[PDB]
Symmetry: C3
Amino acid sequence: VVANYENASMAADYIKRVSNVLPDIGIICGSGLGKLIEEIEERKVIPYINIPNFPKTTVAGHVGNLVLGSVGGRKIVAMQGRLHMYEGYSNQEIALPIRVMKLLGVRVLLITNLAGGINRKLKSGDFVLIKGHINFPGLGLNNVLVGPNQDEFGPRFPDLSNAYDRLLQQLALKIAQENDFQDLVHEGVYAFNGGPTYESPDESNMLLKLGCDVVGMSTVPEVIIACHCGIKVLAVSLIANNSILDAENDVSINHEKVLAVAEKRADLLQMWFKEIITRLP
Amino acid sequence: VVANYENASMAADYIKRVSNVLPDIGIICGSGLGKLIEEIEERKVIPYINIPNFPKTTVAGHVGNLVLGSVGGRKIVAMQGRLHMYEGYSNQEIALPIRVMKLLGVRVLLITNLAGGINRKLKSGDFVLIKGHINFPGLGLNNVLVGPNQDEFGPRFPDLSNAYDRLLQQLALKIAQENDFQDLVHEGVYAFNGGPTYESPDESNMLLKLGCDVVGMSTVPEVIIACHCGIKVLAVSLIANNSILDAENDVSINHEKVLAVAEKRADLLQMWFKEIITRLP
Amino acid sequence: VVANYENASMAADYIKRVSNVLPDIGIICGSGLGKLIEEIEERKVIPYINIPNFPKTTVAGHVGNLVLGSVGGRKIVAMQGRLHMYEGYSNQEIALPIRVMKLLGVRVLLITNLAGGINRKLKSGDFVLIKGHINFPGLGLNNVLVGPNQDEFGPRFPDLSNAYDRLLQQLALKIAQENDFQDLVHEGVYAFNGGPTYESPDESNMLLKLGCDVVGMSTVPEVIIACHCGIKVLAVSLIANNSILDAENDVSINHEKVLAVAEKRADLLQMWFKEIITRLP
Ligand SMILES: Oc1ncc(F)cn1
Ligand SMILES: Oc1ncc(F)cn1
Ligand SMILES: Oc1ncc(F)cn1
């Protein structure tokens, strides 16, 4: 299934027929950070398996829903269950849900994820507003846009220099200042490690030398498909460890330590993003 | 279709039957830079679609011709319409036209492309004689030679240390000195970004740290297949922007700015390469 | 053929029925360095082609055997003929033999390979105990674990920080000290170049900047599959050139120079690894 104009139009025809919502705003929430999606009012929940041309996700399993409703009086659509390229999904499978968002009317996409810290001043539980990226898969001929260009959505050769909207980063920081947690909020460069192994101690050392502030296994593919078709993006990483410090001290990372950090910050992130949605121009 | 001895011999049998030219020299021209190929004398134009075992290019579209004729009294063969790996072509598809060149008798291959500048002293419209490369796809298990080795063409483990012939670089510089444009001519290290997104601002910063002079999305695959089977190579990048400066000043690159630079330099490059062909040993 | 619990159990059922050995220790020997495998006592030699679900290797050709027997009174299993990812084998093909080792009872895996030297103090014929790695394919979405996780073998997101067991590195160094060749033994960080082209002069310069001590085209995939399923690992590189020096002096590497270094050190490595096996806790 190619992520082309006709296959995405077929999916959007089904969603509109079921939901009766035309959303302006899309959200993709990171693992353990999706509590906001249960707070959506006047909801329709749509399993991916019921939507024409949506990718099959029965191998990886776990939740896979599109949720449409209202937050702060705004009309939104959420992916509940994010598709990760380390699972083996092709370029076409990742791109189609984003391109369906576009046809549904999404103009702004808000994204959260979990990441490892590389910059020395970053601590467990800090947040990082992403302002640029280093796309190791893209340099290495695994860019999410490798393949024929779908000209109806965007250009063959996109410019990523404003892929992370500066006015959205400012709005996010203003909201944290209003609530006296700006001291947790940083800006930084995100490195895309295809994964699924955690960054090794010597990979982490390397990324420091190359000026990365955080590293993770998601987000860059969705950002590129969104930028290709003219959707503005805000992306926020929650730091779950300092990998540079682990490397210098011979300490281990693991999934259980990571998920506990998400639990610790989930409710603050929920409230932050609720107010961001309410206050988007 | 594997790029093996028999499939390439089948294609070469067809070309020789149609053209009545045995070329010594191959040329692959970059986008907007192929005007020289219309100046070829006593031509035969052969669409790729008519050549047995040549890769299908009807998805990407646009021109796809092999052109055989005479320049400066020398017998040449040109690819009019270059195959790019960001389109989704496999290793076998890229390699076969080069290996057919070899069976047709090509001993020297001359290549031009468009690239972004990373070295601070490089400006829009400068030329760069490539003297080595950093092959991010190759480090990342997308080398154009991944797969079984075709032993008839070359070794399992090639040495790339003289892939860019030093005497051809000297000849090119001598010709520019004769015409008083040597001040436009540099030498440099080319980084292969698989693409198709332009290098991001923070990717550009990274490449500076790693000692790259230019970056682009082509040329390294063809160079490796040519070196594998013993064809000498000259490769010249036309600089269409300084990406380090764009990053420091928060400026955008785009395809329309890039194509205008090609237009500005096309005729000088045409004349340069005409005299290079005439004067190859 | 997926490298899942049932397909690997089917292979292990066949091996046990033929060999009557339950090994504790696995070995994977590098090119020209497998002489120890002929010294295995009370052997069974099993061609890969006869084992259910083992990957087909008739395209690459050359030896492909599993050998089970006794060394120093210990029960072992060896791969005679290593699978390399530059040949075009998928993730599943590489992983299955290691996962069969696990089901057969392997608790420790010992690995040797040939590599290029990047650290300036390393010379032709030196050995390097690997203590960490930089996995360019993994950063670039070609990690050997990309695809669905096989939960029976290990976790979705493994930690690689103790993938190279520290007590095994110490035991190896102690043995070299006992035999007065500790002056040949170093420790270092290994860069995985997917290959099959040798590291270029400017790739080598880059790797120095990023803190790599050696570079090669194997070993990291097997280490990751082993670590995933809880097998301890010792990995030793034999240095066959200094690629930083070749780059500064404009000198060439080649396969014939490399194989002669293996010949020069094969017998010392054979005896070293024999005593390591004998003395594993
Ligand atoms: O803490 C952490 N989370 C996700 C990562 F990919 C790496 N490190
Ligand atoms: O100016 C420019 N041309 C091609 C590139 F790949 C990047 N930058
Ligand atoms: O000497 C050497 N051996 C293997 C390599 F991959 C590179 N260099």
